[PDB]
Amino acid sequence: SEQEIVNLFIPTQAVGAIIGKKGAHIKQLARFAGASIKIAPAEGPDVSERMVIITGPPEAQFKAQGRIFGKLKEENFFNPKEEVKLEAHIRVPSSTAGRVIGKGGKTVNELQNLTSAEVIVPRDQTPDENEEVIVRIIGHFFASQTAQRKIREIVQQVKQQE
């Protein structure tokens, strides 16, 4: 139950609703979830998505991400007859990324089949100063939470070993 950083991407048009008047909503979410929730600066004036940085343990991530998913649903940011679907980025050790993929890509293939979330480890990544790379997770709230949960397990199982 360590403190993780998750980048959750939301539609740019929803920033005002997520922040709220005088920032009352995003402050409320931060207290409710017990997590830090900040809106990262925009890469440009016409980007279609904005990045929310959520810092906190798994139980806090569930509440912070969940309340953001739920707020977007209230604001009607889903497709017709569909659930709110968001992309999130998590950081895993570069040395464990191959284990998330599995031999022949079979581990990531089963993972996507069980959760219904799309799980992508972008190619040709340069590990960051912590020697960590990105895993992309796209799906509805519960699918995203389950995918995140199992990826965290794989990461911890590899550490356990040696």
Numbering used by the authors: 425 to 586
What does the report in the manuscript say about this coordinate set?
In mammals, there are three IMP family members (ZBP1, IMP2, and IMP3). In vivo functional studies as well as in vitro work suggested that KH34 domains are responsible for RNA recognition.
The overall structures of IMP2KH34 and ZBP1KH34 are almost identical (RMSD of 0.5 Å for all Cα atoms). We observed that IMP2KH34 had lower affinity to the ß-actin C28 zipcode RNA (Kd = 161 nM) compared with ZBP1KH34 (Kd = 15 nM). We found that the 5′ CA and the 3′ GG RNA element were bound specifically by the KH3 and KH4 protein domain, respectively. We hypothesized that the highly conserved GXXG motifs mediate phosphate backbone interactions and that the variable loops functioned to recognize specific nucleobases. To determine if the variable loops mediate differences in RNA-binding between ZBP1KH34 and IMP2KH34 we generated a chimeric protein where amino acids present near both variable loops of IMP2KH34 were exchanged with the corresponding amino acids present in the same position on ZBP1KH34 variable loops. We found that this exchange converted IMP2 into a ZBP1 like binding protein, which bound to the ß-actin zipcode, the ZBP1 RNA-binding element. We observed that only four amino acid mutations in the KH3 domain were necessary to allow IMP2 to bind to the ß-actin zipcode with nearly equal affinity to ZBP1KH34.
